[PDB]
Design a protein around this ligand. Structure first.
Ligand SMILES: CC(C)=CCC/C(C)=C/CC/C(C)=C/CC/C(C)=C/COP(=O)(O)OP(=O)(O)O
Ligand SMILES: CC(C)=CCC/C(C)=C/CC/C(C)=C/CC/C(C)=C/COP(=O)(O)OP(=O)(O)O
Ligand SMILES: CC(C)=CCC/C(C)=C/CC/C(C)=C/CC/C(C)=C/COP(=O)(O)OP(=O)(O)O
Ligand SMILES: CC(C)=CCC/C(C)=C/CC/C(C)=C/CC/C(C)=C/COP(=O)(O)OP(=O)(O)O
Ligand SMILES: CC(C)=CCC/C(C)=C/CC/C(C)=C/CC/C(C)=C/COP(=O)(O)OP(=O)(O)O
Ligand SMILES: CC(C)=CCC/C(C)=C/CC/C(C)=C/CC/C(C)=C/COP(=O)(O)OP(=O)(O)O
Ligand SMILES: [Mg+2]
Ligand SMILES: [Mg+2]
Ligand SMILES: [Mg+2]
Ligand SMILES: [Mg+2]
Ligand SMILES: [Mg+2]
Ligand SMILES: [Mg+2]
Ligand SMILES: [Mg+2]
Ligand SMILES: [Mg+2]
Ligand SMILES: [Mg+2]
Ligand SMILES: [Mg+2]
Ligand SMILES: [Mg+2]
Ligand SMILES: [Mg+2]
Lengths: 285, 284, 284, 285, 284, 284
């Protein structure tokens, strides 16, 4: 049974990548409130990691990405077919691990949240490949489905074993939108160079440019080319800057940071979470 | 939420393709022993259909196929990204259907059987993409995992609601192997022309041809070309025929048919299932 | 200047293709009413030939076609750069020839009709390449511009030298739509097999299918694949038939043919033209 | 009819590029001689601009170019099919504009000049794509038809509304060559990306010289045939042009031409604004 | 050393292909005059085959060919790198075999002929890939280098051990040209469909079409495309036929056959060769 | 015959590359021992040069390389077919020059060494393209055949006209390995960036990485990609450094260097060759 080794090799590859430090901080922060017992908390952490990583392996294939956090994407080393099988294998390894929580609502919640993630991803993929730019409201809505999938899996499972009956769903929605838009910004403003444009996807900045200059189809046409061409990409970033789309993403990110601090105090404060949000906000201005 | 409609369009497309008749027949066949109550049986039939199709959606991306049962492969119409997301989605819709059985071991078994399916696909993919031809025993072993995933799911779930506690795994193993090698044989002997050679996969007839003639590295090299060229395929089938690898697969399918019947009689017989196995065996 | 020979070779090649006997019948059919003097009429006949062929040479590059009227498309032999320059050269040889009519409103009309052609094609290309399926009204609208460009050029230049001042634009619009929709139908129902589906374009049958079954985005996605794959094409033609798109197209064509006859008897009859219209109608 | 907006978008995209400044200067300079009424002169400039730009849009497609004056080429944003049609439309917008001059010979001359432009491009494309290298005299001969197409249109139309009876074709020929050869040098020696002319496979002045100058080598012909984007082959190729003296040869041709333009300007009684432009454009070598 | 088996597999693959039966018939034909001992003659036949086959392996890589004598070309199965090394290896096995003749001129001749073979191939490729169509006299002269390379090795080695010193080079030239031009005609008239067009090579009929019709650059342009499109090829074969290229080649082949009979009868006749040339000539 | 000009162009090109200066310093180093008369020695150096260059022309095609010693590979300028022919031609021009030595064992040795070389080459190719990584010892064995091919031809031919009967093959083997492994290290540790990974080849450092960490299939999968992607290459190089493969290669090269010195002292010393080896060692 070194079948398991071969099957999990693409996953193990991805564990080299950065990302666990922030996932750890989030669990610790939210456990400040939920006060979940050590044994259940670790199964929940393990499970979160597996599903998150499983879904990143798949997103990279859906998105024809080249790098992730400075590293080549699993499937550019091992191939698409091996990575798909492996990611899916790992999803069901997660489900197996969830059953070790031995709580009758755990699998019910796991299903709900994985169904929600797939709706978020579905829409993203749908808009891109059928060339229908979403409205800003549509976009935010699917980001809450995408990111609320894993956000709400983690805190939902924790809640099964917590006495903390205050409402976190609003705060999770803010942090979801925050991570995603922050990501959308980073990708086009500083993964390799402007991958989101090669992907052809509609991210926060490109959406803004599209609706801000409706006589133009320039961004749409560029996204449709799925181009690796550095000069086209450069021209496009120059264009978003002119139309004020980076500006508008910056301000959207400042408001979401404000709201996060507002929502955290509403729950009595959480210094560790404020620290992480302040640290993650460094990446504008 | 006409989003649901969009997310399931690849799945709905695939429900047009032939297949249900034989999945339906098996369910009736096994329920002659298992005698599952009607409300639980439909939930099971629905769940089997979803997971089976979902895995086909993916297998075709994994395998780069062009046709399935005479239809274009889903992703050749809606694109890979969409089809992956939609197959994975239906997996979970399947999990959610399974919770409605309201049996404490249903999920446990569901999990076990998918892990297996995936351990089986893993190896198929691994050997193909890393150019390690499996031995016949290794090949058979993973088929039992690949097919055993779903066969064992359908029947495992049924047994949760049954007082038939006899062991059906040996029979499922034979059926699994029978379906797969049948498949393998049809593919290269009668999907479009020899898709398995274009996929580069090791199937029963080529596994035999490789180990049978170790002077020659010719079939390995042809697989590795992942070619659509019909003249290369024709040459290859001609070689498989000459080394008697189609004869060998026929004699393996004949042994399996006959083992099916003996494992069915060991269980108290089943006309319905013997009909299915005889009907499927006309192909050799 | 045997440069003239190299520059014009692509155009010369295109003149081996069928299509003149139709252009000639129309010329004669309208001249029944217009009764243009021979000297002017021959110049017009030549101008219409140059501009039409020049525009087809470009359409084939725009549309990525492989064959026209059973013959390889010009650029497939001579390459795209040489064809673009050649077609454009011929446009201006067209203009130079229009100048030999010596009618002050000649160039003015010529300019207007070519601008109109480019509007129709501009929309065709746009919808296709930015993936926006037109409503049926929108589509008819651009066909009128596309076909009307050269239809109206030929008859326009003729009417400058005629005493026949009755209005032919309604009849030409009916003839425009008729030729195009007929084209659209023959392309998908009987150029190589279903080239329009490989082009990715939206044609009358595919337009119907898309608004007729709004749950399904299937035709959109096939058009988006720009595929040569014969099975996808077969699958698509099967769907258009199931949803009633070919029937629908055949009805539109019938109403237009009817309307053609009404607009001809509106003008005082034209047996040469009713002949061409009945002949071209045999196709459905 | 927003149809015109879609039609004109690629053309509008090209109008962002540099190039108008030099066109404006030449119009002013030749009007020192031709003294064309400003009503007519505006119309002529607008027509010059339309046809010039339309012909670049097309040339970029013909020449598989990636940049022009530092910008992506229109067809790389909007697709080949859209820009062919857009460009062709603009040609006929051009014709329509020319008719607003109300001169019975305006269109005759329009036609004559585009037909000549088209002969020039024809030979350019032909030699490249049928792998026949032209002689230097052959090349110069076509450059006069290509560049003389548009020069002769601007100045020919102007002459329709002028009493200036002195002959300008020789000076325009000299300018034709100067601009084109200057281009050919800049392209390989220094807007367009690295050595695009090599990737095109075209026979330009320095390659032409290097081919006949060393008939025992077929290495330049063969590199041009490869249509390569490989930066090493291109670097290798420019080394060879420099070793064989093709860049020195081009520089002296360009000096000879600059001298001729000054002598020819002087025969027409001087033109300080044209000398300013020639002198400015000569800094380049 | 099972390295040898792997090293030689591509070569052994090609030994399945038709082509031996003629090479033998020839050897027998010339031994009718040269009367070589059968210990030397066998070693010579073995050297002929090795160098011919090895040179065909390379020619198929050079010419991007898909089939040879109905079979897939070696490198389409084993990959170019392996076949390049395998062919070169067999060249030096050939020289190894040549040394076992112990003739002190064997190697001098061996070298002259391969050097000559390579100057012919070199010219074929140079014209093709730098797009310079050769004149008819230029073509024929390289065909004499290309075919005479091997023809002149077989017979030149045989003559080292013969008391027959009457000159055979004029007959070997006639034969060389007879074989190649027969080939060129079969390719474009009856390997899969018109591969010589896909290759882009200038063959005897394409050469006639080009110079015969110097206004047209249609055949040059089609060859430059390096296309697999059945229609462009079809169109092309039609053009060659209309321009009379196929007639012209039939007559050139007729005249060589006659010149073959006169040069054989010049040498005292040779029924067994008049037999093969007759047999061959049936094809026009 | 300007034929020889065209045919030799790819060769003549490659002579622009650095590499002679080492080949000349080797000749002199060994001629300190062998003391070969000058007319014979010049012929040997020319023969060495031709066959070494001809073989590099083929290697670059086999290995799908872009650069060699900072210049473009021949076939990227002239195309693959022309270089294949030009390379093989030079081989036989080399056989011809060999015959000018007038030694009855010259062609026998020539043949033995080229055969030897093609055996090494074929194995490198075999492993790469059939995805069987060799063992360190296997690899070392084929390197001896590959490099020994040419090394042994130079020194073997020199020895035919030498009174020096001491055994050199142990020192040639040490050098052969030294040269190749030093190449394998440069290639990955400092040709464009890590061309070896794009090629897919198993070179000393990657072989170490593969066996050093058998749970991982990461280096194999990377090599399988035949990638140009700089990020995958960078990743890979970091991985090799983490597994200690560059240290490992460095210590092997240090062992080979010191062995060389022992072997040279065994033969009486050779300052010129010590100086050469010392210089080549500055690179680790
Ligand atoms: C509640 C606690 C303690 C932890 C939860 C921490 C987790 C699991 C966070 C994940 C939230 C998130 C950002 C999910 C998105 C996953 C996903 C499907 C990403 C793909 O989005 P893209 O838009 O394609 O961008 P990338 O390709 O750059 O990832
Ligand atoms: C027995 C009862 C009660 C019901 C039916 C049980 C089911 C669903 C049986 C089907 C089992 C089966 C044959 C599963 C295989 C699934 C799979 C991933 C196949 C992939 O096979 P390939 O070797 O890639 O060939 P195909 O891509 O053409 O399928
Ligand atoms: C009435 C008289 C005197 C003459 C007739 C004048 C002519 C030539 C009329 C032809 C009208 C017509 C059918 C015009 C369409 C021209 C065009 C640009 C067609 C290309 O559009 P597609 O829709 O791609 O058609 P294809 O299917 O050939 O590609
Ligand atoms: C005389 C007045 C008042 C105005 C003239 C201003 C104009 C329109 C000048 C045009 C001069 C010129 C250089 C024309 C060339 C047009 C053409 C078809 C260029 C394309 O040639 P390429 O060799 O492909 O070079 P580029 O692609 O680098 O442009
Ligand atoms: C004896 C004889 C006919 C020798 C010819 C050897 C040779 C190198 C032939 C290559 O033929 P091509 O002209 O490339 O056409 P084929 O590929 O059909 O052989
Ligand atoms: C006079 C003396 C003492 C020696 C002769 C000098 C010569 C000719 C030395 C050459 C020995 C040598 C290192 C040969 C290598 C032959 C070959 C075809 C190598 C190719 O191997 P790759 O691994 O592909 O490496 P490269 O592509 O970097 O060359
Ligand atoms: Mg995504
Ligand atoms: Mg992504
Ligand atoms: Mg499979
Ligand atoms: Mg499959
Ligand atoms: Mg069209
Ligand atoms: Mg078309
Ligand atoms: Mg140009
Ligand atoms: Mg250009
Ligand atoms: Mg050949
Ligand atoms: Mg050939
Ligand atoms: Mg090598
Ligand atoms: Mg190499």
């Amino acid at each position: 049974e070194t079948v398991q080794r071969i099957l999990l090799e693409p996953y193990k590859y991805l564990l080299q990548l950065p990302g666990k430090q922030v996932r750890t901080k989030l669990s610790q922060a939210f456990n400040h409130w939920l006060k979940v017992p050590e044994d259940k908390l670790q199964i929940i952490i393990e499970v979160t990691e597996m599903l998150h990583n499983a879904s990143l392996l798949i997103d990279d294939i859906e998105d024809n990405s080249k790098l992730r956090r400075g590293f080549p994407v699993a499937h550019s080393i091992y191939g698409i077919p091996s990575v798909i099988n492996s990611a899916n294998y790992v999803y069901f390894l997660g489900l197996e691990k969830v059953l070790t929580l031995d709580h009758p609502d755990a699998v019910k919640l796991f299903t709900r949240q994985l169904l929600e993630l797939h709706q978020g991803q579905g829409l993203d993929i749908y808009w891109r490949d059928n060339y229908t730019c979403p409205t800003e409201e549509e976009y935010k809505a699917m980001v809450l489905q995408k990111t609320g999938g894993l956000f709400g899996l983690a805190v939902g499972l924790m809640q099964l074993f917590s006495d903390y009956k205050e409402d976190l769903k609003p705060l999770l929605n803010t942090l979801g939108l925050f991570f995603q838009i922050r990501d959308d910004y980073a990708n086009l403003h500083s993964k390799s160079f402007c991958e989101d444009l090669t992907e052809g996807k509609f991210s926060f900045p490109t959406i803004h440019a599209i609706w801000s200059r409706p006589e133009s189809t320039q961004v749409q046409n560029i996204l449709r080319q799925r181009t690796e061409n550095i000069d086209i990409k450069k021209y496009c970033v120059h264009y978003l800057e002119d139309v004020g789309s980076f500006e508008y993403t910056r301000n959207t990110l400042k408001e979401l940071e404000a709201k996060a601090y507002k929502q955290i105090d509403a729950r009595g404060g959480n210094p560790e979470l404020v620290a992480l949000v302040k640290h993650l906000s460094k990446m504008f201005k």
